[PDB]
């Protein structure tokens, strides 16, 4: 996950 | 660049494919009948015709017909034509078709969408898809510009260009957004407007087809493109769509690989994207650092950002210049707090932001995650020393030996205060000094409203057993958005300031003029944020801190799409909503059309207090 | 050859 | 000698010359090793400065004792009896040998009366008789069925020992005997000999009681009695450490007479000094020497 | 092979690990905390300790513990103790040692069972895998014979269900625990090895990992660590299901380097057929069972059919055998032998005809019947550019084609791996109407075969076979056509149903398997067995499997709640071939030693469509 | 699929 998301 | 060869006349099948693959093209998109070998199903004697119907399977491996052939329906195939018999013979020589290129297992199917009523062949397409098991795509075979419309001016006695969108639209509706139908586009030489472009650019475009009569020629006699052709070239190029070259050879003097020579040529000729690579379209669901612990490497990827920790680098040190005279150098010591310390990123930026200002701090490390209390520990026991003493409290809960001059964290999620940042900060402000200082200070969160039918599908693809079988419509996803169209520029929707002196229950309501016509799919939402005065760190997608890629943004769905025509405003209603022990959004849209409140009391997402 |  | 020690002070036993000998292990942070160190001074201690001789260990200090007067025979971690002695000016702590023989952290160690044989428990379930002249085992014992926690050597007769285990069985062992161990009928956590009676003994549990055997009871403590050391009195107090964090000294009839906490960690070693048999020096996890007056 | 190193000291982890894996352990079995560093939780002034509590999360990279590093659970943590004390804390530090796990990312994790009670061990890890979001797997440490029956004889006054003992506890274990994707076991090989049948049940467990003390190898001649015939074929039976071997204890040949136990192991995994090749990457995969009949199978389907060369060999021998009894060779040359290749598929069944006919020396009128409209298409090219005018290619259903004559032989190609469906039985019938008086069926007969049989990683597959918008408990009604292959076989197979051609399909069946292990049973796996002509036959039954035949795997019979069974237990179960004019189904039902529901009432799971 | 499995 990236972006601050799971 | 990846491309196919799109020929209707194949006479020995091995050769033909030999003769492609020689001049460089990827697939081949050929007829899986005889295209003019019209079958009668009804009617004797031609419907007891004898010997093969088509090509046999062995004339290529099963290993070539899965990857290499994109199957062609027949062109006489006509499953709405006003003529019963015909309607009826087009049905079964269509599903005998589908059902050849379902055996021979292709990858793709080329369908053609060439007038407005494809009623008849939307359902046979999808009765197709709800029987047996198979998995070929359906590419529909649409142009850009109707050929009604780029026929030429000779006769003597005889929705403009957003019409074949509506062909698609229609098509894709009926066929309730299958995952399996896609787009092949047909690029002619009278290009529509930009608009027209970004719904195209939009839809699920699988291929695109260029007929070697949109060439125009050089000064040397090569095939090249016009520079707004060129234009459309390079924004598919950026989808990583297929390019399907049609026709004849218009350049004789040259050979046939001198179009995809041209292809390459522009291919070669076209940070944030590089990270952003392979997590296009991705849903997630948003981090919740304040109700589950993250791993080591979730904070990786949080410390694998330089540019936010120079930022906040820079805030502090730019606020210790301000709050410490040049006089006051040695004797007076900021008290920093870093609430939520992470591993270490936050801690050393302050540590080298007052090293840069030669300013003397006393900091406090607050981090609740008792992993990462480990690390922290360890930095200390190692590096730090006494200067910073770690605390493994949540600062809603922690009692302050002594309070604050800088409060600094980094607690903002992509839409800026769905990782609780309000609430966490307002049960730390009590340790902050009267003339203290909060970093980040400020921070907006901005919502425009998008269309993407890939989104879309996505969003249901997310439906879940043991649940509310729309709960996924009801939730934000973290997603890098790639293929979309945004309808209207972002709009402000939340606005938190540190400290508040003064509920973080919030009401907005955001009207969004769309200058064109569209097909609302759902909201984006980004942030900024000032950290300290004019340091600011945003991922508005035109105040995007450059190469800073910490935050994707977020997607807000809707439940059902909501047509949008030119002049109507989309007038939407955003809650921030919370209890003792929850925080939530609750969104509805309440002009052209109205919605649901989705979300409402946070019954599909809430983010734990 | 790639000259517009 | 290091710069700087561990915190987790393991042991501390007294010579005959009333020197201390201080083991610690680091149990936390990067390198989990472990130290010996010999205090002359034993007021001293926990300063690495002021200390007679230090040692770097490969892994922890489980365990340690003294064999006679220069020798030191250590339990570690990694599976190893070790046997490290002082030279004769007592400034370096120098390896005789270090023999892996366990499977698993050698948890205690004891040595047999003619101070010429050891006895090791380790957490592989095996015990093992150790010949510590020729640097061999004579004996390799799978009799109980977990964990051995203690070993406990005789005073008086060399062959016989006791050992305690998470099985929850005590055995006496005589190492004469074709069969050598004998079931003595909460889990048995510390075994000690009473120096002058030849046949009774005290085991503390790990509910923190302490109860004396022939081969009484007493609500000790509050957690797991981890040592029990008698007093060198003509007739003996009992130091009894636990994981309370308490140390208590008890007379005969296992009846408290001290009490102290000055510990804020686990309490591992009690030592009584040879020269001042009222002071009574406990080491702990907080990496502090703490010297007592009962 | 893939094998770890076991270690409970590790001085500095960098060391230790690049140490460990030069002499070639691929990953390593280590504390995260230290192993007596033993945690207070509830009671002051131990609660308050300072200092980091273990080592930091940075001295390898985060792919270095995702990838090279096992936890293990701390020695001193039992949370079954009765001593409410040590269970809190022991509850505790467990929740704090698995969650530093998650945190590091680690692939997997030790614990062990190593007692009779573990209900608070498996509520822990219970808890703890419903928390959060995580990806490590548990690897349940039990060994082979319990501590307490390898201790020495050696106790004057305490003198020495013994061999199913520890098999109980991970059964306890694992039932508590829901039969958990993410709970496997890690297996302690001792020096004395039990009887061959509770090896059995053990391998029909869900084993991630061997563990094999330095104690148990014996010593060479030359003095090299070896191990015993006895555990050498254990060794090897653990080798087929690709179970990774841990290596404890110390060095116990010290002379050399401790790599020589790991080059034995080597050395025996490259001293361990065509079936074996075909089936890899299909082991314990459940896929769902043809129906030809009312689907229409893809090129790519009838493409691994044709793949199987012994079956086609076995059916032109039996036509051969057939066309030289049916013809004498006085009436070589004017006799011509009508034959009907009943759902000729793309060819094959057809040319095992010709060729049977050619070596046969003899003349043969054939006719291809085939429904599927696309291998009707490969069929007629085949007629146009091979066969002539001596195969006649029918675009029919045998069912309700109109037969211009009647034939001598028909054979199909319609068996299933249960012998039946596929509705052999109902094609066949409808095609009797046009076959002569004399006229041969091949395949003459066919046999159905059921065993009990045992598998937790079976089981678990079928669970993750629910799917949304169906009956929650539907995957259990469905036969799957399985490589079925970490699993245990409770009972020799016994015949279920026979059909014989030329002949009501309906059948019921009861079957009563003498049990003589103490095991829990999960599901029957059905086999069948063909007799084509005389002495030629097809069999799928593991006894007599024909050699390098891989048209068929077992299929698989679930139930929807496991049976546990005892020794002498007979397990009494009933199958039932239901049907009507529309579908045709299976249902089955156990009922003895414990009854169970009767398994799809009324195909409401799974039919075969008529 | 293999062993007449889909
Ligand atoms: N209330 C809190 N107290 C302390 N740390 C927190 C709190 N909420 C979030 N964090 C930490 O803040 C960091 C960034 O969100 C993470 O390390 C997270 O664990
Ligand atoms: N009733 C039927 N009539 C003709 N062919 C059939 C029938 N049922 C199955 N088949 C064919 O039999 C083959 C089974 O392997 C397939 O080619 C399938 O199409």
């Known amino acids: 996950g990236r972006g601050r998301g799971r | 660049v990846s491309s196919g060869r799109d020929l209707n006349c194949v006479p020995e099948i091995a050769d ?3 003769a492609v693959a020689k001049q460089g093209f990827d697939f081949l998109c050929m007829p899986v009948f005889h295209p003019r070998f019209k079958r009668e199903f009804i009617q004797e004697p031609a419907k007891n015709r004898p010997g093969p119907q088509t090509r046999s399977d062995l004339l290529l491996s099963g290993r070539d017909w899965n990857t290499l052939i994109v199957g062609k329906l027949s062109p006489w195939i006509r499953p709405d034509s006003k003529v019963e018999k015909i309607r009826r013979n087009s049905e079964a020589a269509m599903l005998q078709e589908l059902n050849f290129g379902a055996y021979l297992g292709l990858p793709a199917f080329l369908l053609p969408l060439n007038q407005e009523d494809n009623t008849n062949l939307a359902r046979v397409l999808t009765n197709h898809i ?15 510009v109707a050929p009604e419309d780029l026929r030429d001016d000779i006769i003597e006695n005889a929705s403009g260009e957003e019409k074949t969108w509506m062909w698609w639209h229609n098509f894709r509706t009926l066929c309730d957004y299958s995952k399996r139908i896609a787009v092949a586009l047909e690029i002619g030489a009278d290009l529509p407007s930009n608009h027209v472009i970004d719904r195209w650019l939009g839809e699920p475009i699988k291929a695109a087809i260029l007929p070697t009569s949109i060439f125009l020629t050089n000064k040397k006699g090569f095939p090249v493109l016009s520079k707004m052709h060129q234009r459309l070239i390079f924004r598919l190029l950026k989808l990583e769509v297929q390019f399907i ?4 050879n218009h350049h004789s003097e040259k050979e046939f690989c001198s179009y995809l020579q041209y292809l390459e040529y522009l291919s070669q000729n076209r940070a944030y994207e590089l990270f952003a690579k392979g997590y296009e379209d991705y849903l997630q669901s ?7 612990n993250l791993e080591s490497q979730t904070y990786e990827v949080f410390e694998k950002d330089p540019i936010k920790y120079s930022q906040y680098q820079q805030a502090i040190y730019k606020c210790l210049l301000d709050r410490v005279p040049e006089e006051e150098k040695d004797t007076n010591v900021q008290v920093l707090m870093v609430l939520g310390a992470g591993r270490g990123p936050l801690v050393n930026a302050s540590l080298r932001a ?8 006393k900091l406090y490390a607050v981090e609740k995650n008792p992993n990462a209390v480990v690390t922290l520990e360890n930095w200390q026991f190692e590096e730090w020393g006494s200067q910073v003493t770690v605390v493994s409290s949540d600062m809603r809960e922690w009692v ?5 001059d800088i409060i600094v964290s980094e607690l903002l999620g992509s839409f800026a205060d769905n990782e609780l940042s309000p609430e966490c900060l307002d049960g730390a402000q009590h340790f902050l000094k009267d003339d203290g200082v909060s970093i980040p200070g400020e921070y907006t969160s901005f919502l425009a409203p998008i269309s993407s039918s890939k989104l879309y599908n ?6 879940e057993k043991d649940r509310d079988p729309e709960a996924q419509f009801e939730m934000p996803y973290v997603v890098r958005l790639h293929n979309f169209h945004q309808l209207s520029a972002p709009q402000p929707c939340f606005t938190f300031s540190h400290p508040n002196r003064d509920d973080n229950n919030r009401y907005c309501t955001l009207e969004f003029p769309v200058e064109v016509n569209t097909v609302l799919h759902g909201f984006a939402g980004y942030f900024e944020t000032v950290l300290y005065q004019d340091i600011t760190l945003s991922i508005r997608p035109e105040t995007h801190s450059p190469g800073m890629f910490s935050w994707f943004p977020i997607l807000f769905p809707i439940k059902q799409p909501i047509t ?3 002049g109507q405003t989309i007038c939407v209603r955003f809650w921030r909503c919370s209890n003792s022990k929850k925080v939530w959004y609750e969104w509805a849209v309440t002009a052209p059309v109205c919605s649901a409140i989705h979300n409402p009391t946070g019954r599909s997402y809430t983010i734990g207090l | 050859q790639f000259e517009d | 000698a290091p710069a700087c020690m561990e915190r987790q002070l393991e042991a501390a036993r007294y010579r005959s010359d009333g020197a201390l000998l201080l083991g610690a292990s680091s149990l936390s942070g990067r390198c989990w090793a472990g130290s010996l160190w010999l205090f002359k001074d034993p007021c001293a201690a926990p300063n690495e400065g002021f200390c007679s001789a230090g040692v770097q260990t490969e892994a922890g200090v489980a365990d340690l004792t003294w064999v006679g007067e220069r020798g030191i025979l250590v339990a570690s971690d990694s599976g190893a009896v070790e046997l490290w002695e002082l030279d004769e000016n007592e400034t370096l702590i120098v390896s005789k040998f270090c023999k892996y023989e366990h499977d698993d952290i050698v948890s205690t160690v004891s040595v047999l009366s003619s101070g010429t044989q050891a006895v090791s428990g380790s957490k592989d379930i095996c015990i093992k008789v150790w010949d510590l002249a020729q640097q061999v085992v004579l004996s390799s014992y799978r009799a109980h069925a977990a964990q051995v926690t203690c070993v406990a050597a005789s005073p008086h007769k060399d062959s016989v020992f006791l050992s305690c285990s998470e099985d929850n069985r005590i055995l006496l062992w005589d190492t004469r005997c074709p069969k050598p161990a004998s079931q003595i009928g909460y889990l048995p956590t510390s075994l000690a000999w009473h120096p002058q009676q030849s046949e009774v003994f005290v085991f503390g549990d790990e509910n923190g009681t302490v109860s004396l055997v022939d081969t009484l009871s007493s609500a000790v403590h509050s957690q797991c009695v981890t040592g029990l050391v008698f007093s060198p009195h003509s007739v003996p107090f009992l130091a009894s450490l636990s994981e309370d964090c308490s140390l208590a000294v008890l007379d005969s009839s296992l009846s408290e007479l001290f009490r102290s906490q000055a510990h804020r960690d686990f309490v591992r070693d009690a030592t009584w000094s040879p020269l001042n048999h009222s002071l009574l020096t406990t080491v702990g996890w907080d990496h502090q020497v703490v010297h007592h007056v009962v």
Chains 1, 6 share one sequence.
């Open chain 2, 400 to 404: 302050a030996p002594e309070k604050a």
């Open chain 2, 286 to 292: 948003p981090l919740q650092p304040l109700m589950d």
């Open chain 2, 16 to 18: 033909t494919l030999g």
């Open chain 2, 354 to 361: 007052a090293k840069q200002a030669d300013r003397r701090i």
């Open chain 2, 245 to 248: 070259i049609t026709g004849t």
């Open chain 2, 458 to 463: 996505e969003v249901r693809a997310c439906r």
């Open chain 2, 130 to 144: 709800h029987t047996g098991h198979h998995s070929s795509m359906f590419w529909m075979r649409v142009p850009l």
């Open chain 2, 564 to 566: 949008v025509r030119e």
